[PDB]
Design a protein around this ligand. Structure first.
Ligand SMILES: *[C@@H]1O[C@H](CO)[C@@H](O[C@@H]2O[C@H](CO)[C@@H](O)[C@H](O)[C@H]2NC(C)=O)[C@H](O)[C@H]1NC(C)=O
Ligand code: NAG
Lengths: 155, 199, 190
């Protein structure tokens, strides 16, 4: 039992432990996002991603979470429990990303383009918000990301 | 005023409840996270009851929802936490048929239907919804030890038992990746007495 | 205040103990504080250390950091001593700790038999662990079966036995988070 994002296999990351970390802080993080009218990880981003797409999309989304979202969260939080819960998620996301070596050959170009398209729909939604508000929202939406990834946890 | 406004979810039956005058009046609205418009739940405007069935209106599994209660004496408004049925739902015990035989006990796990319906079609079961779902079955023998069986299949049978003896079956649904485990179904049963000469 | 020295992690069956030599302070009793970074923090936010769950102002020369190590990646750990105003400088663990290197022992194990049925009770090593149990009828013939047992502390049925030959059993441990099994325990036969 591993994640299988098309051909990339990811071991050592237990989905229920990712939940346990996020559920310690989910309420406080969701309560803080005062914008109920907008969702960044929208349906168009994650609905019926093909197996061959999935690896490129997951790489791009996680990197964005690592480089942008968690980094600025770490830099700003004043609650130790969210520092600990997001460390757990960011550390496991590091382990996922190290195991993603999707193909870089030309026959895959239009598949990576579809995956990048989905990512850019998320990115655009994120940049339409003020930056403090977009960070808060992206933190509180981690659950949407975990729920999608779990679909690929199989034999 | 209004405290404890929240969802309870059992087998994706999603019930809003709240608590804190005696002639106080409650009105309910719901909404999808990411859409702008609040909708009025028909059947739940200006009620005295503390309960409201949103099973239909919060039944798309890819969405998250908000609901909101407005109260006023004979005013204040409170909204729920962001709600995901997948995350929040508890699982009822499975429906099981335990059949006693002379040297075994057979158990048939029935699929569990749900109020979730697949786009244009049939109501989905828990087995459809959670690909990682499985059953754990235990038979307590003497009172010392246990026989364990489990898997995705539905029919199970514990072999090697003594005729004419009391056992306790307990059967759970497990969805390990969501850290969900059902309430147990239980059957206390006796293997039939052995009246033939077959041993 | 001297900083604590000789930092190491003893990690046994997914329990991780950070340890150091005590700082000498005839007079008052010294307290210690532990902080950590996962690899994430190490690479992307290297200036940020997180307080340990159970060791801020702890007393003994150790800390169970099990609850802080929550991914299979290398972790930095540092510790310091306090005695009122005087804090020591921080001491950093020399080689970052990765729970992939935990010491998996062979599991303890008790065989029992109520008449004809054969039963096993493993030692409760925790949620991190699944148990593989190999068992066989001890003749040239039968080939060894395998029952996965979720949890220790419970006497579980393996096989109902047949007359004639002894039945033999050994057990092993498996840890999904690191991809590793332990050695088998000693074979026992009834
Ligand atoms: C909440 O409402 C749903 C229907 O809107 C109820 O359950 C289903 O609906 C009808 C009427 O009860 C039945 O024909 C189905 O068999 C029911 N399905 C399930 C899975 O129960 C549900 O019981 C309601 N709960 C309340 C009023 O508490
Ligand atoms: C659930 O929501 C999404 C988009 O909002 C949709 O594509 C899917 O078909 C929905 N379920 C239905 C219409 O039954």
């Amino acid at each position: 039992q591993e994640f299988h994002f098309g051909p990339c296999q990811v071991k050592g990351v237990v989905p229920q432990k990712l939940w346990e970390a996020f559920w310690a802080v989910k309420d406080t993080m969701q309560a803080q996002d005062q914008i109920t009218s907008a969702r960044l990880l929208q349906q168009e981003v994650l609905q019926q991603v093909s197996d061959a797409e999935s690896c490129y999309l997951v790489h791009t989304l996680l990197e964005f979470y690592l480089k942008t979202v968690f980094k600025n969260h770490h830099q700003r939080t004043v609650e130790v429990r969210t520092l600990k819960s997001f460390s757990t998620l960011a550390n496991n996301f590091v382990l996922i990303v190290s195991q993603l070596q999707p193909s870089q050959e030309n026959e895959m170009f239009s598949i990576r383009d579809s995956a990048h398209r989905r990512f850019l729909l998320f990115r655009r939604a994120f940049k339409q918000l003020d930056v403090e508000a977009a960070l808060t929202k992206a933190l509180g939406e981690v659950d949407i990301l975990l729920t999608w990834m779990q679909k690929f946890y199989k034999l | 005023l209004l405290q404890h406004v929240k969802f309870q979810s059992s087998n994706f039956e999603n019930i809003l409840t709240w608590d804190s005058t005696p002639d106080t009046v409650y009105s309910i609205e719901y909404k999808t996270y990411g859409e702008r418009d609040w909708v009025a739940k028909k059947g739940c405007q200006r009620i005295t009851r503390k309960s409201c069935n949103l099973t239909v209106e919060t039944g798309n599994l890819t969405e998250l929802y908000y609901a909101r209660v407005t109260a006023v004496s004979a005013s204040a408004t409170k909204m729920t936490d962001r709600f995901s049925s997948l995350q929040h739902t508890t699982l009822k015990p499975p429906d099981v048929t335990c059949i006693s035989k002379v040297r075994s006990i057979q158990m048939i796990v029935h699929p569990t239907p749900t109020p979730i319906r697949a786009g244009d079609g049939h109501r989905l079961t828990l087995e459809d919804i959670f690909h990682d779902l499985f059953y754990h079955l235990e038979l307590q023998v003497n009172r010392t030890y246990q026989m364990h069986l489990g898997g995705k299949q539905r029919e199970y049978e514990f072999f090697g038992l003594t005729p004419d003896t009391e056992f306790l079956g307990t059967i759970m649904i497990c969805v390990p990746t969501w850290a969900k485990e059902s309430a147990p179904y239980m059957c206390r049963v006796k293997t039939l007495p052995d009246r033939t000469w077959t041993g | 205040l001297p900083a604590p020295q000789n930092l190491s992690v003893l990690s046994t069956n997914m329990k991780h103990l950070l340890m150091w030599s005590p700082v000498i302070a005839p007079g008052e009793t010294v307290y210690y504080s532990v902080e950590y970074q996962g690899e994430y923090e190490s690479l992307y936010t290297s200036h940020i250390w997180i307080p340990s769950s159970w060791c801020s102002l702890t007393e003994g020369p150790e800390c169970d950091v099990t609850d802080d190590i929550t991914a299979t990646v290398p972790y930095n750990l540092r510790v310091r001593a306090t005695l009122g105003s005087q804090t020591s400088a921080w001491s950093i663990l020399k080689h970052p700790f990765n729970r992939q290197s935990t010491i998996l022992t062979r599991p303890g194990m008790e065989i029992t038999k109520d008449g004809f049925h054969l039963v096993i009770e493993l030692e409760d090593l925790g949620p991190q662990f699944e148990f593989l149990v190999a068992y066989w009828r001890r003749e040239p013939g039968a080939e060894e079966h395998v029952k996965m047992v979720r949890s220790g502390g419970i006497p579980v049925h393996l096989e109902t036995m047949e007359p004639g030959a002894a039945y033999c059993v050994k057990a092993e441990t498996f840890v999904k988070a690191i991809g590793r099994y332990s050695a088998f325990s000693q074979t026992e036969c009834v």
